[PDB]
């Protein structure tokens, strides 16, 4: 097979070899942001930048078009039971497929509800962001992501917004609209996934707007001017209203 | 089984000669490259033997074929010496078939459903094959030398460009007609062994599988596989010794490992490599013999069945 010559294959092989030889694990980035004010980190060496209760602030039960999807199950059940169309055995049995597939979109919506960030922290060095979220069943998932892997989207959520000049924070510091950011690589439950979109709801307080914007735009934060606040206010498995 | 034979129709001598010549011609034309690869593998392994371990023990026929093709000669490079090989095979087949048919006609049983025992048939076939191989030895020598030229260093090559050219060069440069019969004893031994180690196992397994599964069509080909395997097992050492004797150049300095005879070559092979060294190129030899036997049997059976139907024999008599 190799004896067959194809310039496209040769170009692909050359591109792969050149990439492997040139690009290394270590990379140089000049996107460094120096905050004006000193950063007060928690007792754990982290600074909280975002907080919200997406499950509390979202619609769970009566959601469109999932109500429409689930309202047709009785119709199919009645049609199968009474055979109003006078169908054959297999034809009438074919009507029982819909009840087994109508609830899947609601399951996917409930799963997506757990990708709205509940809590966001920036670690020492301004290179790691910890995002904590929860599922509708109360399971809590926390994941650490490097700041460079964030990419904000436009308000319409259909395109990548310019990282440098992005207008998603109001003058005071809060979000104009529910922000969306795509993480190139997300490690969730010890499994790496590609191009995962997460959301910050507009109905959520934003702490340290400068740090939040820097993390969103992917800049590495300079944390040289820092202080440590020894306050043990948060307990393990602490309760919250995101249930 | 002594009355299980059905010899209700026997071809004439001229028909046998013509059919054998044509079928052997096409079979040799088809299967020559495998023999070429086998000879090249034997030459390249001569003096070293098998040094791989476990599953890699041996020489890869595909590797040898790829190396030969990489020389730039294409597929025509695998047919070098094909003229000499075909001439030698034709002469051997003609002589062997003539002698075998003459003896068989002389000593045949009267009854049509009775046939000579396997022992007697093997004795006659071995005698005929030995005589034919002794008569036609120089052609095999020329073909083997032409094949080994590529493997050997340029200075050791003979540069034969045809059967007659090689015969003349051997007669003149080496001196005398005796130089044309080098390896004749080895060729005779190989021919006798191959003749006696093919007809027996084939019938053995064919009858056994017929008894087991009754009358079917795959029985003939399964028996052919078995017979080819056992014939290769029996004959490959003799073929290797014959190849070594043929490749032995006249000049000892040219020779990498000089030999004085069949026994001397066997002793040298045993010394410089284990007994397994007798079976280099076994896969190539097995493939060659099986393909040749299959094509020959298929064509001969088709033609013979057609002739029998024309004559008017019953379905079972065919």
């Amino acid at each position: 097979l190799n004896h067959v010559q194809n310039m496209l294959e040769e170009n692909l092989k050359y591109d792969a070899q050149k990439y492997n030889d040139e690009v290394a694990v270590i990379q140089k980035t000049s996107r460094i942001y120096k905050p004006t004010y000193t950063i007060e980190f928690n007792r754990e060496g982290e600074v909280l930048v975002y907080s919200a209760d997406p499950i509390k602030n979202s619609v769970v039960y009566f959601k469109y078009p999932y109500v429409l999807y689930e309202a047709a199950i009785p119709l199919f059940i009645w049609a199968w039971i009474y055979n109003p169309l006078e169908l054959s055995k297999n034809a009438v049995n074919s009507l029982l497929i819909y009840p087994n597939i109508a609830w899947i979109p609601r399951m996917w919506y409930w799963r997506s509800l757990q990708y709205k960030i509940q809590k966001m922290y920036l670690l020492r060095g301004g290179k790691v962001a910890k995002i904590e979220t929860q599922s509708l069943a109360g399971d809590r998932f926390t994941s650490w992501v490097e700041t460079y892997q964030f990419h904000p989207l436009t308000q319409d959520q259909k395109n990548f917004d310019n990282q440098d000049n992005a207008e998603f924070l109001e003058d005071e510091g809060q979000l104009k609209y529910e922000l969306g950011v795509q993480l190139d690589n997300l490690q969730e439950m010890g499994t790496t996934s590609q191009d995962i979109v997460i959301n910050f709801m507009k109905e959520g307080t934003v702490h340290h707007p400068e740090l939040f914007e820097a993390i969103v735009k992917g800049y590495n934060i300079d944390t040289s001017d820092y202080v440590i606040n020894t306050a043990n206010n948060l307990r393990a498995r602490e309760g919250n209203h995101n249930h | 089984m002594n009355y299980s034979y059905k010899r209700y129709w026997e071809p004439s001598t001229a028909e046998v000669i013509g059919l054998s010549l044509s079928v052997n011609t096409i079979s040799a034309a088809l299967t020559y490259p495998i023999e070429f690869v086998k000879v090249r593998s034997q030459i390249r392994t001569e003096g070293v033997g098998i040094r791989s371990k476990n599953l890699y023990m041996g020489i890869n026929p595909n590797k040898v074929f790829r190396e030969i093709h990489a020389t730039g000669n294409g597929l025509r490079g695998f047919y070098q010496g094909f003229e000499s090989h075909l001439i030698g095979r034709l002469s051997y087949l003609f002589i062997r078939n003539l002698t075998y048919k003459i003896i068989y006609d002389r000593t045949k049983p009267v009854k049509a459903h009775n046939d000579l025992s396997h022992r007697e048939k093997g004795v006659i076939a071995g005698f005929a094959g030995g005589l034919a191989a002794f008569l036609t030895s120089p052609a095999d020598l020329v073909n083997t030398r032409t094949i080994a030229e590529g493997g050997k260093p340029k200075e050791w090559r003979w540069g034969y460009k045809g059967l007659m050219d090689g015969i003349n060069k051997i007669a003149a440069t080496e001196g005398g007609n005796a130089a044309l019969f080098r390896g004749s004893y080895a060729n005779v031994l190989r021919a006798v062994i191959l003749n006696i180690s093919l007809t027996g196992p084939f019938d053995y397994l064919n009858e056994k599988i017929w008894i087991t599964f009754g009358d079917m069509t795959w029985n003939k080909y399964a028996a052919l596989l078995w017979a080819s395997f056992w014939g290769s097992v029996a004959t490959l050492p003799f073929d290797n010794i014959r190849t070594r004797l043929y490749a032995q150049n006249a000049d000892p300095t040219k020779n990498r490992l000089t030999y004085s005879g069949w026994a001397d070559a066997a002793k040298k092979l045993i010394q410089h490599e284990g007994i397994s060294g007798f079976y280099v190129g076994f896969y190539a030899f097995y493939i060659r013999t099986f393909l040749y036997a299959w094509t020959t049997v298929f064509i001969t059976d088709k033609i013979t069945s057609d002739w029998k139907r024309k004559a008017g024999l019953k379905e079972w008599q065919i």
Binding site: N6, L8, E9, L12, D15, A16, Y19, N20 | -
Partner: protein, 57 residues
């Protein structure tokens, strides 16, 4: 054969869990040391097809 426990049959303590995790990650790195990275694999898969008719855009 290689034992799956790596010498730590039970994670009775978080220290044992950490040791097992460290050695497991090292072993996985060693085993994956001989295959291309995610980017290379993805680009090769995406641009595998090379059979077109008209060129010179």
């Amino acid at each position: 054969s290689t034992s799956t426990t790596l010498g730590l049959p039970r994670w009775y303590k978080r220290i044992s869990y950490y040791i097992f995790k460290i050695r497991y990650l090292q072993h996985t790195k060693s085993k994956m040391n001989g295959i291309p990275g995610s980017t290379v694999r993805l680009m090769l898969i995406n641009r595998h097809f090379v059979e077109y008719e008209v060129y010179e855009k």
